[PDB]
Amino acid sequence: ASVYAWNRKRISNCVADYSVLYNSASFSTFKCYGVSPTKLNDLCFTNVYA
Amino acid sequence: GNYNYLYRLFRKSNLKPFERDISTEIYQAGSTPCNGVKGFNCYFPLQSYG
């Protein structure tokens, strides 16, 4: 989608494998501002907005 | 900007009490090994306060 109409996907009621997303080398920027990248597979959240 | 004061942004493990780490070795922040060379998910541990 475009940036003025960014698509919002609600991630809930599922188990999320952030290790596959973090270990992918295609991403040129992986910067977190409230959590740690190595603790995404350990922490639990109510829902994720993408 | 006074950049002479630096803190350890990246380390593998937490320190002991009264433990000092001055080792300027590279950190591996991803699955890919760094081999002492900066790159993708390879960052210097010491970053300066701005």
UniProtKB/Swiss-Prot annotation, chain A:
Record annotation: effect of changing S26P: In strain: Omicron/BA.1, Omicron/BA.2, Omicron/BA.2.12.1, Omicron/BA.2.75, Omicron/BA.4, Omicron/BA.5, Omicron/BQ.1.1, Omicron/XBB.1.5, Omicron/EG.5.1
Superkingdom of source: Viruses
Biological role: Attaches the virion to the cell membrane by interacting with host receptor, initiating the infection. The major receptor is host ACE2. When S2/S2' has been cleaved, binding to the receptor triggers direct fusion at the cell membrane. When S2/S2' has not been cleaved, binding to the receptor results in internalization of the virus by endocytosis using host TFRC and GRM2 and leading to fusion of the virion membrane with the host endosomal membrane. Alternatively, may use NRP1/NRP2 and integrin as entry receptors.
Quaternary structure annotation from Swiss-Prot or TrEMBL: Binds to host ACE2. RBD also interacts with the N-linked glycan on 'Asn-90' of ACE2. Cleavage of S generates a polybasic C-terminal sequence on S1 that binds to host Neuropilin-1 (NRP1) and Neuropilin-2 (NRP2) receptors. Interacts with host integrin alpha-5/beta-1 (ITGA5:ITGB1) and with ACE2 in complex with integrin alpha-5/beta-1 (ITGA5:ITGB1). May interact via cytoplasmic c-terminus with M protein. May interact (via N-terminus) with host bilirubin and biliverdin, thereby preventing antibody binding to the SARS-CoV-2 spike NTD via an allosteric mechanism.
Protein known as: Spike protein S1
Upper lineage: Viruses, Riboviria, Orthornavirae, Pisuviricota, Pisoniviricetes
